[PDB]
Design a binder for this molecule. Structure first.
Ligand SMILES: CC1=C(CCC(=O)O)c2cc3nc(cc4[nH]c(cc5[nH]c(cc1n2)c(C)c5CCC(=O)O)c(CCC(=O)O)c4C)C(CCC(=O)O)=C3C
Ligand SMILES: CC(C)CCC[C@@H](C)[C@H]1CC[C@H]2[C@@H]3CC=C4C[C@@H](OC(=O)CCC(=O)O)CC[C@]4(C)[C@H]3CC[C@]12C
Ligand SMILES: CC(C)CCC[C@@H](C)[C@H]1CC[C@H]2[C@@H]3CC=C4C[C@@H](OC(=O)CCC(=O)O)CC[C@]4(C)[C@H]3CC[C@]12C
Ligand SMILES: CC(C)CCC[C@@H](C)[C@H]1CC[C@H]2[C@@H]3CC=C4C[C@@H](OC(=O)CCC(=O)O)CC[C@]4(C)[C@H]3CC[C@]12C
Ligand SMILES: CC(C)CCC[C@@H](C)[C@H]1CC[C@H]2[C@@H]3CC=C4C[C@@H](OC(=O)CCC(=O)O)CC[C@]4(C)[C@H]3CC[C@]12C
Ligand SMILES: CC(C)CCC[C@@H](C)[C@H]1CC[C@H]2[C@@H]3CC=C4C[C@@H](OC(=O)CCC(=O)O)CC[C@]4(C)[C@H]3CC[C@]12C
Lengths: 575, 571
């Protein structure tokens, strides 16, 4: 009974009560069947016979069969049951997805997505299967066991309660032990299956060397051997399944035989009448064709057990590198940035962070162009709250970044990337993606402010186009102009920027760095680059060898100094 | 094999016995109730009841928790599908290595074997379908109609005639409705995970935008649309099962009321209602699985047509005009005047010109790049020549069979890949005809024995992805071991000599002298020893010969050749 919405409470309650009705008509259908046989044994009036027989046939319509042609009640149960499985499935999928995008960058670098999204989806499938399995299979079939014991031990002869109770115990125990034994065979068949498939696929994939040494004949022979070995073990596993099913049938056979003969004895001794015998025979088979399906669901709870703990592990792994639990906002006015004893160990990088101390001028442009290596992108990520400070003081406008909180940061800050990574979507969403809660007419206004109008008329249908892998393919300058529309919509306090090594054409280049100067106006920027035009518009440059600051000044100061920037400028002057 | 003829004969007979059980178990049930309603002599009653319960054990309910004969047919039928699965799998794999590289290098091996196992599973599922569900359930329908028709009054044959024909007809029309919902479904599943995985990939730009609220709201919107489609899915399936259920109910109701009327009128006996009331459920419950197999038939037949597509086709790059044997005896190497057409590249053959008699080791050199193995792929009959003649030992390669040239040539690539196995089958892999004494004798004779015995397991070491991981020089020496135990008539070589260890490079060159002990080789390399080893050296620029002459002649010519050699050697 989830407390989400009152409609869902009523669907849950009506489906539970409807389950109760099905487990109630489980006993009525045999009881009616016995009454019909008694009406036919000694003669009955047709007028009452017809109504009782029709009443029975509609009750057997309500439950056509056990797990096959389940019947009106079970079918109506399953159709209304999905409308709470949608709720719980949707809720857990949203929660796990929010947690996946909660986790930090360092989690997301190496491990992929489809190897994790499968874990999420199969975990949701596992929990839905667990609740549906349990509530509709464990408690109902155990309830049927209690009703069989109770009803045959009260209203029919007590030793048939004995035969049924013993037969249920013999069946359930035998089923679970041979399911374990079959389980060890399942794993044994699976491990060889991996080997036969692996040898096959690599023997094919090495076609160059198979061709190189005439290896088709021996390759056929060894693949046939792997097939024969897999066959000779699959025979063993399927013989185990055969023995399991056959002894399930043999225990049902002994249980039915004991009851049928004992009932025959009591009916011939006339303590019971023929209807009671027909009831016993039809009630056992009804009681068991669910139950062989119970064993199947107990061997498909094994996969669920592995998925659920894995789902719980992913759900409970949160980096939580730094945050202020009091939700303390940011008080930002100009862009005063502080460097003092800023040291941090960096993983998987040639450069590291080694005691940098050079505050940037607020309102000005202090670029960082220098050596090969992604330490510039590293300090960009570090300033953009992606890695923990080990030792250092970072004070945007005079307050520590560890306690001013991330929502206030990303409201107060806006940073563009170097590779515009875009979806298979429209363009209107990707230009309003800077501020999704901003109106359309102003996002066309900011798009024309970026200059995106030219691609709009280049589109087959303009601002309502489809762009991506499932849409049209734009160019890099177009997409970076979408990105600058994103950031001017996002209204930054401080802009940080990077580019790749690609410039499309001079006509778009002059426009895009004109707009870069426009957005860097009234803003401090610490830009990183490898493009001469995006370096010369910035005045003062910081160059860092291996995490520590080494040169200083402006670009002509570096040229007269003769540093690595001067060598790069000579190399770009004459290639 | 004739034993499998015995297994299939006993399997068809076992199906026949299983059809007999289906009519007999209810006829026995009617007899037990008959003997029960009038007063029963026990000593016939007890034996008839246990005879029935024996027979009901053999049948094992309807289907699901299947009976003795069904499990026996399923068990002993494995021995036949194993045969046809193994045979058609070997047919695929033989004709798929025998298929040319041209389609094969354009395909990835993960999906081709996926299609192969899917096609084989399709063939066995389809044949088990067609002889174990189609003919059986149709046979059971006929026996039900005939039994209730001729052995009873005609109207019950009427009822079950109409009920099976109607049940199957309704199951058809509703299963194509369900199928059109299923395809609209599964394309919307394709959307609903594509946008999920793209969001997870674009996480970084999301984090710069702080757009996680927007992306979870877009996700939950399109998953709500998914939920609506799921609801329509299950409502369709519920209508299918419930309409079936209504047909079951209509047949049972019509029969039960009609039977009750006849047994009140005593044209039918009191057992006969129990006969019909159990028998029509016994017919009905397998037919619930028949819609499952009319839904299997679609996937089955599209994959098995895919199997005939990929199998009965050919690529067959090397045509067999005369398919003759080569008159090779000493090994003249002859490239002359071939204009071979080539696309998606610049490596057409614009009449390269070099030939060597036996007694002349041959070289090749040109620009940078790994495309020089195209010449060797042309050399070992992977692509036929358009216009011109290529000879080996004076014999043109355009008319002989492929296997006549396949054996005689020893080529070592840059990396002969070592399998996930021992080294016994690795030295067996060079050539299989020889014995253990001479393959480990050539293992000592090729200088791999030192590190084989230096490794802590010796000749039986487990090596590869399923074993230990070796080194590049050792596996190159393994390739040299394979070709020196192969003992091919003439050797066309490629050589790594990747300057890792100088001692192993000297072992490589000693192996080179031993494998070229008065026999010719052609070498594609850019290192000093492996270029001065050959008698003459030709420069080829994508099929264009530009300079020929020895190492000192080319270095005295001194152009792009000498500057790339000296810039590679030093800086
Ligand atoms: C009635 C029924 C449901 C619905 C009830 C419920 O869901 O609660 C169900 C669910 C599922 N069945 C599933 C998968 C499979 N079940 C198979 C095989 C079988 N199904 C059977 C019965 C059922 N199974 C049985 C007695 C067999 C053996 C005979 C045969 O082989 O027909 C096969 C092999 C097919 C082949 O070998 O041809 C597969 C791949 C999946 C996973 C997702 C998917 O793959 O759809 C799920 C949730
Ligand atoms: C939350 C869920 C698990 C509740 C499920 C409850 C049902 C499994 C039980 C509860 C009470 C049971 C009923 C209690 C008493 C009877 C009367 C009983 O008939 C008689 O008393 C005599 C019949 C005869 O003469 O043979 C038939 C079964 C029935 C309807 C039972 C059917 C099964 C019921 C509904
Ligand atoms: C919703 C669709 C699937 C139609 C379902 C129809 C049933 C609900 C109807 C059709 C046949 C009807 C039966 C036809 C005949 C009789 C006998 C009748 O008894 C008599 O009057 C005897 C003489 C005679 O019927 O001519 C009592 C009602 C009953 C059981 C009827 C009960 C209601 C039934 C089952
Ligand atoms: C090829 C595959 C599909 C198997 C087909 C089997 C049928 C051709 C046969 C084999 C044994 C037959 C059964 C053998 C004996 C009987 C008893 C017979 O009982 C009688 O009352 C008839 C004789 C009499 O009048 O005394 C009714 C038919 C039945 C069940 C037969 C039904 C048809 C069966 C199943
Ligand atoms: C497959 C393995 C696990 C053994 C299964 C046991 C059956 C083969 C046995 C157990 C119950 C036995 C039955 C128990 C009672 C009787 C009644 C008996 O009738 C009599 O004449 C003796 C009793 C009397 O006097 O009424 C004839 C043998 C029979 C059918 C037996 C036949 C053989 C049965 C079915
Ligand atoms: C959609 C599927 C379920 C087919 C439905 C067919 C029924 C609507 C038909 C087929 C058989 C018909 C019956 C065939 C025979 C009889 C017996 C007949 O009366 C006699 O012949 C009595 C003879 C005697 O006194 O022994 C009256 C009509 C009736 C009930 C028919 C009523 C209409 C029935 C049930």
């Amino acid at each position: 009974w989830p407390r989400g919405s009152p409609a869902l409470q009523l669907v849950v309650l009506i489906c539970l009560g409807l389950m109760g009705l099905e487990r109630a008509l489980n006993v009525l259908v045999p009881i009616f069947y016995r009454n019909i046989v008694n009406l036919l044994t000694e003669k009955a009036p047709w007028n009452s016979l017809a109504w009782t027989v029709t009443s029975y046939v509609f009750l057997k319509f309500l439950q056509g069969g056990g797990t096959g042609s389940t019947g009106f009640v079970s079918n109506l149960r399953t159709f209304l049951w999905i409308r709470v499985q949608q709720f719980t499935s949707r809720r857990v999928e949203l929660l796990i997805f929010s947690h996946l995008h909660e986790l930090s960058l360092r989690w997301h670098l190496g491990r992929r997505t489809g190897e994790v999204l499968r874990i999420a989806d199969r975990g949701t499938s596992s929990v839905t299967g667990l609740l549906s399995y349990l509530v509709f299979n464990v408690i109902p079939t155990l309830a049927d066991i209690i009703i069989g014991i109770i009803y045959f031990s009260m209203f029919f002869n007590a030793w048939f309660g004995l035969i049924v109770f013993l037969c249920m115990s013999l069946y359930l125990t035998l089923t679970i032990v041979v399911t374990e034994w079959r389980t060890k065979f399942r794993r044994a068949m699976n491990t060889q299956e991996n080997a036969t498939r692996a040898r096959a696929v690599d023997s094919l994939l090495n076609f160059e060397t198979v061709k190189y040494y005439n290896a088709e004949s021996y390759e056929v022979e060894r693949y046939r051997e792997a097939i024969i070995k897999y066959q000779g073990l699959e025979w063993k596993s399927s013989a185990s399944l055969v023995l399991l099913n056959q002894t399930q049938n043999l225990v049902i056979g002994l249980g039915l035989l004991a009851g049928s003969l004992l009932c025959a004895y009591f009916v011939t001794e006339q303590k019971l009448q023929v209807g009671d015998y027909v009831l016993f025979g039809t009630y056992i088979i009804q009681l068991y064709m669910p139950l062989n399906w119970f064993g199947t669901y107990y061997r498909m709870i094994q996969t669920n057990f592995i998925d659920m703990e894995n789902m719980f592990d992913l759900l409970k792994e949160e980096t939580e590198v730094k945050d202020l639990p009091g939700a303390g906002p940011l008080r930002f006015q100009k862009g005063r940035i502080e460097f003092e004893n800023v040291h941090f160990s960096y993983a998987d990088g040639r450069e590291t962070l080694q005691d940098v101390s050079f505050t940037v001028m607020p309102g000005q442009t202090l670029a960082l162009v220098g050596p090969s290596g992604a330490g510039k992108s590293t300090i960009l990520r570090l300033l953009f709250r992606f890695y923990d400070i080990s030792s250092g003081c970072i004070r945007i406008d005079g307050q520590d970044i560890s306690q001013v909180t991330q929502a206030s940061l990303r409201s107060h800050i806006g940073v563009v990337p170097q590779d515009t990574v875009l979806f298979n979507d429209t363009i209107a969403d990707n230009i309003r993606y800077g501020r999704v809660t901003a109106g359309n007419d102003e996002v066309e206004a900011a798009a024309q402010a970026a200059g995106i109008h030219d691609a709009i008329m280049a589109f087959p249908e303009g601002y309502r186009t489809q762009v991506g892998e499932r849409g049209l393919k734009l160019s890099g300058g177009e997409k970076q102009r979408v990105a600058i529309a994103r950031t001017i919509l996002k209204a930054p306090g401080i802009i940080l920027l990077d580019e790749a090594t690609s410039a499309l054409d001079t006509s778009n280049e002059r426009a895009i760095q004109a707009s870069l100067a426009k957005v860097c106006a009234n803003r401090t920027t610490i830009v990183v680059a490898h493009r001469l035009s995006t370096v010369v518009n910035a005045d003062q440059i910081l160059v860092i060898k291996d995490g520590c600051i080494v040169e200083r000044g402006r670009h002509e100061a570096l040229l007269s100094r003769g540093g690595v920037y001067a060598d790069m400028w000579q190399l770009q002057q004459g290639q």
